């Protein structure tokens, strides 16, 4: 058996890069250090469908075809389409994402990643009010106060707390004992169970709580005697905890991007972090979901100027989330075709968007059997980034780490599939 070290895990935005892979033959049979989720990706579960070849639905029955036919049929769909949606991207590597931007350009497509169902609202907020962040290493070595706001890292970023809170840092040699841990969540989550402070606020009322907290912070009196289910007195006690930090980090997640107010919940949170810096060093990090959702928003931004919801229909890049986002085009029935790559909107879009996927050509570059492949017309299986293919990924706070190739696969990588898709879309348009 072979032990491959320093492997980067291809699941969540923690992007752990200390994974040991156990390799038998040409196959990954075990892991060390990876959490329960990361391990499940690296190893094959018995009975689980791993598509060996492309597939196409001929009316009602899937048939195996070759790469050249599947890519050909997909290229024609996009070429003849007048509002194609190219969605996903977060679970592949950056060079494939770069090819996707060029392909969306060539097809006059809308290109969009899972940010539109995730921390997109944080993107909208940071575009309006700012983005005061730091890297994990400053948290580990400096953080005096650690807040998890509307995120549940024990279930969604399982090693996040061990690496950033329990870890012993340069100015924090005592690890957990040197930090006040705060969690804000209407549920007593397993993350909240470890907290020194658990603000079990009323759901959908974060914006109100943050308004009281900020008014208090700037010296004003809190109008009502209770906000978001938290009595006035503890609003003030919480603001004092933050003001007296030597170094504070606000980790936030889906509890405020998906909640009532969405991008404006992130907005008010950011500006409080900003204003806290007149009393104490303060910074925040969005708990980005997939291991490379951040990588797409980086690539798309630097190539086009915009991070997601990018519309190339006019040639020029244009950007207005709420119009040009995956769920906007699907639910308003604007999109006339959809290409999914490294994402599962069949499982993870709402009912109203799925109703539209039922009516339009759906292309799916996907290695596994999913609700999206059950709604797909063409299925194209690729080599999996981080296990069978290498490339750049971006951690939740922007740190670039290269994904490693551990074992070989006969399948093509996402990049090769997209470059062939791009060549023949040009062929049709000429």
């Amino acid at each position: 058996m072979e032990y491959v070290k320093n492997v980067v895990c291809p699941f969540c935005g923690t992007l752990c890069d200390d994974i040991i892979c156990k390799v038998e033959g040409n196959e990954i049979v075990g892991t060390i250090n990876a959490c329960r989720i990361g391990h499940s990706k690296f190893v094959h579960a018995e009975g689980a469908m791993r598509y060996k070849k492309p597939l196409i639905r001929k009316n009602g029955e899937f048939v195996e075809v070759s790469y050249d036919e599947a890519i050909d049929k997909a290229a024609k769909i996009l070429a003849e389409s007048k509002r194609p949606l190219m969605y996903g991207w977060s679970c592949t590597e950056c060079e494939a994402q770069a090819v996707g931007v060029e392909l969306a350009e060539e097809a006059g497509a809308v290109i969009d990643n899972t940010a539109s169902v995730c921390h997109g609202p944080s993107v909208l907020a940071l575009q309006d009010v700012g983005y005061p962040i730091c890297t994990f290493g400053e948290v580990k070595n400096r953080a005096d106060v650690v807040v998890y706001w509307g995120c549940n890292p024990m279930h969604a970023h399982p090693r996040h707390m061990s690496r950033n809170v329990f870890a012993r840092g340069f100015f924090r040699e005592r690890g957990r004992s040197d930090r006040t841990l705060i969690v804000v969540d209407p549920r007593k989550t397993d993350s909240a169970k470890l907290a020194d402070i658990h603000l079990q606020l009323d759901f959908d009322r974060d914006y109100e709580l943050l308004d009281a907290m900020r008014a208090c912070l700037l010296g004003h009196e809190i109008l009502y005697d209770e906000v978001a289910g938290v009595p006035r007195e503890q609003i003030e006690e919480a603001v004092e905890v933050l003001k007296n930090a030597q170094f504070g980090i606000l980790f936030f997640g889906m509890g405020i991007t998906h909640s009532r107010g969405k991008h404006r919940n992130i907005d008010t949170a950011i500006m409080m972090v900003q204003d806290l810096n007149d009393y104490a060093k303060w910074t925040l990090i969005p708990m980005r979901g997939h291991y490379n959702v951040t990588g797409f928003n980086q690539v798309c931004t630097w190539e086009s100027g915009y991070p997601y919801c990018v519309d190339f229909s006019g040639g020029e890049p244009r950007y207005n989330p709420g119009e040009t986002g995956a769920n906007d085009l699907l639910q308003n029935r604007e999109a006339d075709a959809m290409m999914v790559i490294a994402s599962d909107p069949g499982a993870h879009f709402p009912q109203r968007a799925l109703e539209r996927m039922a009516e339009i050509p759906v292309i799916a570059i996907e290695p596994h059997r999913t609700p999206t492949t059950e709604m797909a017309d063409i299925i194209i299986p690729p080599a999996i980034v981080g296990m069978e293919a290498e490339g750049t990924a971006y951690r939740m706070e922007g740190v670039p780490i290269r994904m490693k190739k551990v074992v070989d696969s006969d399948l093509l990588s996402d990049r090769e599939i997209l470059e062939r898709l791009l060549e023949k879309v040009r062929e049709y348009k000429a």
């Binding site: 200390d18 994974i19 060390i32 990876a34 399982p158 061990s162 329990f166 993350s191």
Partner: protein, 80 residues
């Protein structure tokens, strides 16, 4: 006697106990700093195949720190 016992089927693989343990910290600077070990080291427990895995129970001093760090009671100090 009281000893360390793992319940892997409840485990998240999160690594809090591995990092929280002072014996592990003392022997592995990376574990002390919140990382899984990449160096070969002999420590009390590791996360392996996604779950906590006891490798050297004789080094366990039954202090209780790991237990405090687990939110899902997957590692405990009990009889046997």
């Amino acid at each position: 006697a009281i000893g360390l016992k793992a319940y892997p089927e409840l485990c998240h693989g999160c690594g809090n106990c591995v990092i929280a343990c002072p014996v592990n910290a003392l022997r592995s600077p990376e574990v002390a700093g919140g990382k899984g070990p990449t160096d070969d080291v002999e420590i009390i427990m590791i996360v392996e195949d996604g779950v906590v895995n006891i490798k050297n129970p004789d080094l366990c001093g039954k202090c209780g720190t790991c237990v405090e760090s687990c939110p899902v009671d997957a590692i405990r100090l009990e009889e046997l």
